[PDB]
Amino acid sequence: ELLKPRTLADLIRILHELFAGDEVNVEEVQAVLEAYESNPAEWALYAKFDQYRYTRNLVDQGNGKFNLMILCWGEGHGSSIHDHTDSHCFLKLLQGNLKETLFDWPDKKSNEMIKKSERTLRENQCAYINDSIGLHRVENVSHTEPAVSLHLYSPPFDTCHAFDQRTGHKNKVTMTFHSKFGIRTP
């Protein structure tokens, strides 16, 4: 019985219930993420920015079944074109806006990766991606407003691939946490 999360802590409790089993009801997870109304005071602890690139801040390690983290995007900060390592990936905006650009999986032939579409993800909206849908790039294109997003991945993963937009060639990247549970982890 999906109820509206009252707070971030409540959302986390609800997520532990939704991931109690072996499968994932994507539409339910997306719905409860969207229903949480971002309250900056509840997540300030995790919103640790870096001047030069976006940061990944672990919030909850789940139940063996999911990571939950907050990403902090300075003005002009963005990601590579990347995959999600056979995991579900939910992205909910907590503050600001992000541009999501979708790409198809490249062919073996070296070729420019042409965007398939783009959209603007706005505060409180929750997007979903997985490798069957495609690849994406996420960017804070704002010149004046930092963005903060809440990401849930299931199963957890700590590596993915970055794709060269000019060729489609991929390289494996290991993702690192800037902080965990509010503690900076250099």
Per the annotation, binding residues for Fe cation are 82, 84, 136
Alpha carbon separation from 179 to 48, 52, 147 (Å, rounded): 8, 16, 17
Segment 82 to 101, residues that bind ligand HCS, using CB under 6 A: 89, 91
Query: Pairing state of beta strands 55-60 and 179-180?
Result: parallel
Among 138, 147, 148, 152, binds ligand HCS (CB under 6 A): 138
Q: How far is the CB of 64 from ligand HCS (least distance, A)?
A: 19
We find the least distance from the C-beta atom of residue 6 to ligand HCS, in angstroms, to be: 26
- Of 56, 77, 88, 178, which lies in the binding site for ligand HCS, with binding defined by CB under 6 A? 56
Query: Residue 177 CA to chain centroid, in angstroms?
Result: 13
Cα(54)–Cα(73) distance, rounded to whole angstroms?
A: 4
CB closer to ligand HCS out of 7 and 125: 125
**3-state percent breakdown (helix, strand, coil) of the chain, nearest 5:** 15, 35, 50
Report the residue closest to ligand HCS, judged by CB: 138
Residue 3 Cβ vs ligand HCS, minimum distance, rounded to whole Å: 27
**DSSP 8-state symbol, 78:** B
| Rounded Cα gap, residues 51 and 77, in angstroms | 9
Q: In whole angstroms, how close is the CB of 41 to ligand HCS at the nearest point?
A: 24
Nearer to ligand HCS, 56 or 65 (CB): 56
| Residue 175 lies near ligand HCS (rule: CB under 6 A) | yes
Minimum CB distance to ligand HCS, residue 175 (Å): 5
- Total binding residues toward ligand HCS, as defined by CB under 6 A: 8
Q: How far apart are the first and last CA of the chain?
A: 40
User: Environment class of residue 172 by beta-carbon count within 10 Å: exposed (0-12), middle (13-18) or buried (19+)?
Assistant: exposed
Residues at the contact surface with ligand HCS, assessed by CB under 6 A: 56, 71, 79, 89, 91, 138, 151, 175
